[PDB]
Design a protein around this nucleic acid. Structure first.
Lengths: 742, 250, 709
RNA sequence: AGUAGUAACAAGAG
RNA sequence: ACCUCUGCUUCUGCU
């Protein structure tokens, strides 16, 4: 007797057991080594889908430019970028007519948001390409290096506070004949030694004033860094992703904000809406698209997938979209929205680490960077790479980058591209044929609903949709798309079978220990269980079991097994003592070797609150010591919020609410000085917060100096301290004497 | 008063020309920028990193201060902390055992007003503790995905209005130009000022808790029957697609 | 030319503050000299009232100490001004004015608003009374010596004099230079947002236009003016018919078997590649009180019990992996046994020649500089190794069969939860007595815990002992049906050097595992292993040989991490089956857990199609189905990689198409061979993918036959 | 060797 | 070889 797990599908329909088709207890795929091979593929493919268009040379950058828009229509079913402007405009006009006032309202709101948006908004953009150092950096550090560097070139818009004047400086910086900036330089130093020679040649990193030409800067400002995407599920082979620089970030926020305002009011968009709100919106839409089916007709649904989605979408079309959408807006805002598409139309792709060459006999290896990619006969590259590099040449720049006018980078204009997708869905019909289409859109993913008299006419409508999308530069995957009679379909990994079904496996990795800290992770753990009970059909038995699994993972992860256990370890030694010393052991937290108190009915209550009145007074005094050294300086987001790949959690602040040490690899790199740079900023900010206690909670505002604010606050504090009898004349005189020098 | 200490520190800082130019060139707006300047890097795989980190000797960073110094270097052969300092906190790095030592033999702090600070969480527990449970039945349930209030509130406000109220409670001198809200919620403000008077808990923590009981969390959930927040907070136990659990809150 | 006047008559401090104030109201000093003047005058008058006056230590006004009589609120940034105003109001126990004051008198304890008017002071006085009521004292001045103060105004006569003198002095100087008309004559300009494009960005935009446009100005007007109606219909009329979605109605006969090459006997059968043994495992059992202990001590006590196996120094080589060194591997095994058996606490292994070989010491290539590498003709970019193509192996089916089977042992370490109160909780606890028990007793569960606990300790050793070779026992704690606990020793493992920076960095792990399985019975399964015959055991009545499976293996931080989280295999399987119990419970109006598992007075035990026996469907229990899914989820971890990810994702399309056929929903397809191409390229050397492809085809066959009936 | 799989690790930096 | 630092800290150039 041989077991076959697929036989389960004989008894249970596949949607009803779809969770068992997701292997999410398995390791997700990671990349090793360089991503240059994948990035070069993207460059080749992107140009392959557009090379029947117009080729020219940019007189700004000298790069090789390819323009497929208004190019020759395709005569095959290969991926096409040859979008026709008039067809895009007609699609948008239809959307405008279908949604009166929406375009101007979206523009209005996006504009007024921009007007109140401050520069610090750009600190939450995650990893960012830093043009000063030509490396990826945190958003905040990249923003800071740009502002300080701009000051060296008579650019001080950032001081005004708003995002607009900072963006003004960004585009004006492109006119500067030279850009001066700070960057670390590795300077060789010959130091007097003690051995025979009496000298040793070290390499010291120290900040230096550097400068580059106007053209060199423009290229950097137009550049995007690239790398391989890791931990992406459900794919055999790896792919490249890009990271934008700081110059374009501000402009992209506004365009996506604009697109978001539109998407929120489109019945077809599965974006930005998410979770249960998405489920509700989509099932309502399916009901209507099914109810409208002519009596005695046939309704079909295409489970859709778009191929080479980003590679075929064109910046020039997105420029046309902003222009059309912002029709009734003031010129300054129309110009503002045009910048991001323009910068993308002239984007340059950095090609990554390059390739590694080796000698198996000598057991040697070396990294050949992208500038020196052709500093070597192509015979010495392998077969696939050799062919790539040949096709790369016409777009290759000697500094080791590649021109890339057409295409988008993976997921940059998500909202705006969704609007384009919906624009296609909004056509509904062609030539008054006896069918109507409609559907759902979410970036590359779509679902097409088609009502007709018979199914052959449905397929004609699908063919017309397929052909219409070609005119917008949208390419439907014929390999991964399928179609069937309305009633069941898939969309963004949500499975519908006369109603959306649960897919418990999708969320399964989130049940694990999150890795924020002991306190947060307990709250997060129980909350995940609680939410999955509500949303993803996790019954009470599985939920209770999930509590058990988590505590097990929790105890082994944080080495905090029960005090009555005999497991050994550094922490466990003290946990056992705590067990012996404590009377109210049921009041001990799990992290302190205490018993798990959690069940279904109390998942939503913080652990410390559940156990508070069971605690030994001396224990709770230690655990909740307000000046404990483990918590440190908090932010209201550091107490409440955590990421998942954001959810908020309820936890009491205590000694378990600690923070991990800073990664110390930087100690050995040429980025040493950022430590001193950080610690300097920190001192100033810490003292500022001493003067202004609300700084941590509400953002300080002001174009005046930090010093001026602190000085005036301390002068007033002192003055009123003296008159209220909190300060003696001796103190007040010294206080005013000190402030006098300042 | 801490005023004179602050002034002496400020004068100290201005001896260092690096810190001086920072305080001069950095606008109050730009405090929000340099606050977030650091060598750290958003962890893309925290669950992995934590399991890895918990196997190292000194994965935690302490706040530099006297309380940190009360933790001994070692305890019965266990290295609780190291002399090497963290790049971020500039304080000593320590083991997870250090946390356990503190909770076992550390200084006993003051928890006066704790229950008033976390009053919101204790009211959850009280609603559960005083609740009675009816029967559980099995049968089909029609759930509708509605926006519902997840947590019961002290007094619901828009985020802006709530922020202003919290400024009047915790940071009146920095609250800026007065609002209509200050007048409307004057009794709420007065009451919270009294309740939060003695606490030594950090104001930012107090702000977070005030925010939980003023700012509503209204999210879409599949619900059937009562949609009041005292039910929604227990929703995971009240119903599924195929069952009902009668619940009378306290 | 007032800007010249302002510079000569007012101090620098005053002018700066006035300009800053205008900036806060977003207004240009250079385009509004009149406003700049009025703000300068107003600010100075505030300072004129203040400059001279002070307070002594008894709170009495005098004229010249560091405590002035007046606080000058005007002239400083809003946030500072409000800080000052509220600090004063709160400190002196008075209400905070809703508008921003110009002065505060420390002696009067009153806020003051200051006014400057060209007309009547009385008019301006009562225009302020409307708005401030009487929250502040008023001090209105004019240029021709007129003025209006509130009844309790703090202004002394001498100060009033300086203010009016200074104002008239200014009035004279202005009219003397014909600048008074500039102040009177209206000055007002509309404030638009300022965003303008320089040369470079304008040029970049010009070359960002579609073909058919000369410049951006052309595109903008075009988009603004023209009606594109009919454009889509026109382009579709001239677009080639070769551009089509090529729809094809799907039929059962269109669905051929996937990956036909897995049946090709010209290929090698897929070998065993997992990190540890599974169904072939053998744990040396040693009864205990049931509580935890040092892993070295456990292994030492198990090996003391089975001392004949422990002391075996003369084994029999049975099978040898191609590139393995059986002498080094055996020496390493002896080193492990001797190290764990000794009295020392340390489990560190000496970096011997045989341990250096087994753990891959010094095998990483040397990094040389690119200049040297470029000039070296012999250094090339390696061709990438591709996963081999394998055929079905019988052992994968065997593993699935045995792991799905019940045993007498339980290995799960599930901790406590608070006692039940709500009926829902009681229901959950009663359900678990069926679900968790069913899984806890099956073979797969015990194998899972072996992986989980081993990866747990291996991860720790890898970080804590990076530079040390270390022997790590492979263990479990097991409980029989009588409740007696046993420590299980499946073997010993050697951790090599583990300076794991990158998450994909590899630590070599050499495994030595016990087994009753003779590798010669199914040699195709064991090409990676070097197996010794080391002894015997009386399992029941007769002997079974005990082998030692030796293998150089490896893992990384990621694989170790997900290993520690493999317990979640419980949830994925349990959620699926509990859902069915809840659906069944809904129909009949009571908890159907017992009825599904064991059957009822009114209900037959729930059965599932579980597998085949010489061609025919075989039914199985609800519990069996649970164990099969659980095992399936465990195999996802054990054999998880990109091949499994791709296979599962792409084949899921065919699954949903097959469902459409079964539902008679008339599915259509656009490129079927393309869809198959996506699936079949994921079928290489992953044992579970290959076996799933086989199972897929078998299942597909039965669905085809069932479609007819 | 081995891990692994379109390119890496099998220590790196001073 | 010896000592020091590092275990997600990014490498275009300085080289």
């Amino acid at each position: 007797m041989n077991i076959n797990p697929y036989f389960l599908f004989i008894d249970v329909p596949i949607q009803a057991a779809i969770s068992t088709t997701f292997p999410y207890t398995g390791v997700p795929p990671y990349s090793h080594g360089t991503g240059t091979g994948y990035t070069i593929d993207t460059v080749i493919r992107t140009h392959e889908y557009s090379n029947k268009g117009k080729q020219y040379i940019s007189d700004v950058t000298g790069c090789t430019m390819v323009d497929p828009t208004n190019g020759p229509l395709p005569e095959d079913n290969e991926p096409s970028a040859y979008a026709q402007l008039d067809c895009v405009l007609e699609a948008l006009d239809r959307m405008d007519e279908e949604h009166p006032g929406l375009f101007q309202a979206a523009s209005q709101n996006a504009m007024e948001t921009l007007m109140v948006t401050t520069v610090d908004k750009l600190t939450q953009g995650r990893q960012t390409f830093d043009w000063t150092v030509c490396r990826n950096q945190p958003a905040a550090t990249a923003l800071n290096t740009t502002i300080t560097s701009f000051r060296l070139n008579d650019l001080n818009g950032a001081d005004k506070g708003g995002l607009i004047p900072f963006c003004q400086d960004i585009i004006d910086s492109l006119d500067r004949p030279e850009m001066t900036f700070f960057s670390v330089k590795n300077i060789k130093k010959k130091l007097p030694a003690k051995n025979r020679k009496g000298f040793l040649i070290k390499r010291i990193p120290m900040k230096v004033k550097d400068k580059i030409t106007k053209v060199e800067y423009i290229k950097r400002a137009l550049s995007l860094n690239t790398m391989t995407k890791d931990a992406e599920r459900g794919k055999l082979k790896r792919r490249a992703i890009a990271t934008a620089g700081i110059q374009i970030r501000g402009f992209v926020l506004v365009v996506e904000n604009l697109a978001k305002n539109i998407c929120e009011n489109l019945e077809q968009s599965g974006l930005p809406v998410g979770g249960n709100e998405k489920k509700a919106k989509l099932s309502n839409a399916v009901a209507k698209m099914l109810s409208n089916c002519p009596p005695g007709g046939i309704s079909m649904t295409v489970t859709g997938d778009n191929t080479k989605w980003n590679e075929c979408l064109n910046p020039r079309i997105f420029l046309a979209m902003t222009e059309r959408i912002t029709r009734d807006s003031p010129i300054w805002f129309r110009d503002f929205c045009s910048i991001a598409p323009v910068l993308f139309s002239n984007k340059i792709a950095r090609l990554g680490k390059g390739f590694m060459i080796t000698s198996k006999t000598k057991r040697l290896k070396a990294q050949i960077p992208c500038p020196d990619l052709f500093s070597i006969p192509l015979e010495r590259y392998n077969e696939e790479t050799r062919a790539k590099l040949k096709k790369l040449k016409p777009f290759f720049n000697e500094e080791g980058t590649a021109s890339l006018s057409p295409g988008m980078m993976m997921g940059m204009f998500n909202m705006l591209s969704t609007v384009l997708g919906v624009a296609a869905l909004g056509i509904k019909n062609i030539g008054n044929k006896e069918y109507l289409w409609d559907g759902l859109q979410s970036s590359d993913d779509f679902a097409l609903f088609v009502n007709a008299k018979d199914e052959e006419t449905c397929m004609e409508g699908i063919n017309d949709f397929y052909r219409t999308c070609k005119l917008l530069g949208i390419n439907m995957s014929k390999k991964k798309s399928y179609c069937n009679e309305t009633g069941m379909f898939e969309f963004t990994s949500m499975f519908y079978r006369d109603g959306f079904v649960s897919n418990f496996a999708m969320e399964l990795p989130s049940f694990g220990v999150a890795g924020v800290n002991e306190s947060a992770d307990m709250a997060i753990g129980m909350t995940i269980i609680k939410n999955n009970m509500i949303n993803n059909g996790m019954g009470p038995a599985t939920a209770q079991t999930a509590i058990q699994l988590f505590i097990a993972d929790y105890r082994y992860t944080y080495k905090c097994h029960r005090g009555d256990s005999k497991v050994e370890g550094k922490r466990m030694k003290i946990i056992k003592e705590l067990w012996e010393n404590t009377k109210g052991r049921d009041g001990l937290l799990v992290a302190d070797g205490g018993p798990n108190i959690y069940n279904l009915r109390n998942l939503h209550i913080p652990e410390i609150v559940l156990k508070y009145n069971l605690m030994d007074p001396e224990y709770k005094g230690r655990l909740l010591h307000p000046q404990n050294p483990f918590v440190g300086h908090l932010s209201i987001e550091g107490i409440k919020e955590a990421d998942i790949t954001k959810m908020d959690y309820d936890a009491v602040s205590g000694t378990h609410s600690w923070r991990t040490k800073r990664n110390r690899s930087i100690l050995n790199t040429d980025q040493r000085n950022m430590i001193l740079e950080e610690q300097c900023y920190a001192k100033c900010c810490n003292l500022f917060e001493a003067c202004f206690n609300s700084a941590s909670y509400r953002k300080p505002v002001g174009q005046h100096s930090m010093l001026e604010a602190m000085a005036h606050r301390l002068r007033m504090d002192a003055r009123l301290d003296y008159e209220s009898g909190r300060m003696s004349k001796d103190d007040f005189e010294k206080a005013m004497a000190h402030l006098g020098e300042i | 008063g801490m005023t004179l200490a602050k002034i002496e520190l400020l004068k100290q800082l201005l001896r260092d020309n690096e810190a001086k130019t920072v305080l001069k060139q950095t606008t109050v707006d730009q405090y929000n920028i340099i606050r977030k300047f650091n060598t750290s890097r958003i962890e893309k795989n925290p669950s992995l990193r934590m399991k890895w980190a918990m196997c190292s000797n000194f994965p935690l960073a302490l706040t530099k201060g006297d309380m940190a110094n009360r933790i001994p270097l070692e305890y019965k052969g266990i290295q609780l902390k190291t002399n090497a300092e963290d790049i971020g906190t500039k304080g000593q790095m320590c083991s997870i055992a250090a946390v356990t030592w503190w909770n076992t033999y550390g200084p006993i702090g003051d928890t006066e007003g704790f229950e008033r600070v976390y009053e919101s969480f204790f009211l959850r527990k009280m609603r559960l503790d005083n609740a009675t449970w009816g029967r559980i039945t099995f049968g089909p349930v029609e759930r509708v995905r509605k926006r519902v209030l997840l947590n019961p509130l002290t007094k619901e406000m828009p985020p802006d209005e709530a922020s202003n109220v919290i400024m009047e409670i915790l940071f009146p001198k920095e609250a800026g130009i007065p609002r209509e809200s200050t007048w409307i919620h004057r009794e709420l403000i007065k009451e919270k000022r009294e309740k939060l008077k003695g606490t030594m808990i950090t104001p930012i923590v107090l702000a977070y808790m005030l925010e939980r009981e003023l700012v509503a969390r209204r999210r879409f959930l599949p619900v059937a029957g009562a949609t009041s927040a005292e039910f929604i907070e227990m929703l995971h136990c009240l119903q599924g697609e195929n069952w009902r659990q009668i619940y009378h809150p306290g | 030319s007032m800007d010249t006047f302002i510079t000569r008559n007012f101090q620098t401090t005053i002018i700066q503050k006035a300009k800053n104030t205008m900036a806060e109201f977003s207004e240009d000093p250079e385009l509004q000299p009149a406003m700049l003047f009025n703000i300068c005058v107003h600010l100075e008058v505030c300072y004129v009232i203040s400059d001279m006056n002070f307070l002594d230590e008894e709170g009495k006004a005098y004229t010249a100490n560091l405590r002035p009589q007046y606080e000058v609120i005007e002239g400083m940034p809003r946030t500072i001004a409000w800080m000052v105003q509220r600090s004063l109001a709160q400190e002196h126990g008075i209400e905070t004015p809703k508008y921003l004051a110009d002065l505060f008198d420390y002696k009067t304890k009153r806020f003051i608003e200051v006014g400057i008017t060209k007309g009547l002071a009385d008019d301006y006085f009562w225009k302020k009374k409307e708005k401030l009521g009487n929250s502040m004292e008023l001090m209105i001045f004019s240029y021709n010596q007129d003025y209006s103060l509130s009844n309790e105004s703090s202004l002394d006569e001498e100060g009033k004099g300086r203010v009016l003198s200074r104002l008239t002095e200014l009035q004279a100087e202005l009219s003397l230079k014909n600048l008074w008309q500039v102040l009177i004559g209206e000055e007002d300009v509309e404030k638009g947002i300022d965003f303008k494009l320089g040369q470079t960005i304008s040029r970049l935009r010009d070359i960002s236009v579609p073909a058919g446009f000369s410049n951006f100005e052309g595109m903008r007007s075009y988009i603004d003016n023209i009606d594109p109606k009919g454009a889509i219909e026109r382009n579709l009329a001239r677009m080639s018919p070769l551009v089509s979605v090529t729809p094809k109605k799907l039929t059962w006969e269109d669905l051929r078997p996937i990956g036909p090459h897995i049946y090709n006997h010209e290929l090698p059968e897929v070998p065993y590649n997992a990190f540890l043994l599974m169904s072939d495992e053998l744990g040396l059992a040693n009864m205990t009180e049931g509580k935890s202990k040092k892993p070295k001590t456990l292994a030492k006590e198990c090996l003391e019990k089975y001392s004949t196996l422990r002391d075996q120094t003369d084994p029999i080589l049975i099978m040898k992996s191609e590139k393995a060194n059986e002498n080094f591997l055996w020496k390493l095994w002896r080193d492990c046994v001797n190290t764990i058996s000794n009295e020392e606490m340390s489990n560190e292994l000496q970096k011997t020649n045989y341990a250096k070989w087994a753990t891959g010491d010094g095998l990483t290539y040397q990094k040389i500089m690119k200049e040297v590498a470029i000039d070296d003709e012999t250094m090339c970019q390696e061709e990438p190794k591709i996963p081999n193509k394998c055929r079905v192996a019988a052992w994968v089916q065997t593993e699935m069969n045995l792991l799905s089977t019940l045993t007498s042992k339980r290995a799960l370490d599930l901790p406590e939860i608070g006692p039940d109160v709500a009926p829902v909780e009681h229901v959950g606890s009663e359900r678990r007595k069926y679900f968790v028990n069913e899984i806890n007793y099956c073979k797969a569960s015990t194998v899972m815990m072996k992986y989980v606990l081993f990866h747990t300790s291996l991860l720790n050793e890898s970080n804590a002992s990076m530079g040390k070779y270390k022997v790590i026992p492979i263990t479990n704690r097991v409980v029989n049906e009588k409740g007696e606990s046993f420590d299980m020793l499946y073997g010993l493992a050697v951790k090599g050097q583990s300076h794991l920076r990158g998450d994909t960095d590899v630590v070599t792990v050499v495994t030595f595992e016990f087994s009753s399985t003779d590798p010669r019975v199914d040699s195709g399964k064991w090409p990676k292993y070097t197996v010794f015959r080391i002894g015997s055991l009386f399992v029941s009545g007769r002997e079974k040989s005990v082998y030692l499976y030796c293998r150089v293996n490896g893992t990384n931080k990621i694989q170790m991490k997900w290993g520690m989280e493999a317990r979640r295999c419980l949830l994925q399987s349990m959620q699926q089956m509990e859902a069915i119990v809840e659906q069944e419970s809904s129909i009949q109006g009571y908890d159907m857990t017992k009825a599904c598992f064991k059957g009822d007075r009114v209900n037959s035990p729930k059965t599932f199609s579980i597998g085949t026996q010489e061609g025919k469907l075989v039914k199985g229990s609800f519990g069996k189905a649970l164990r099969v899914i659980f095992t399936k989820c465990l195999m996802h971890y054990v054999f998880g990689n990109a091949q499994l990810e791709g296979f599962s994702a792409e084949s899921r399309r065919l699954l949903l198409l097959i469902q459409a056929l079964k539902d008679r929903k008339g599915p259509w397809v656009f490129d079927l061979e393309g869809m198959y191409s996506g699936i079949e390229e994921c079928i290489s050397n992953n044992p579970w993918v290959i076996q799933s492809a086989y199972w897929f085809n078998e299942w597909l066959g039965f669905e085809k036959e069932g479609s007819k009936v």
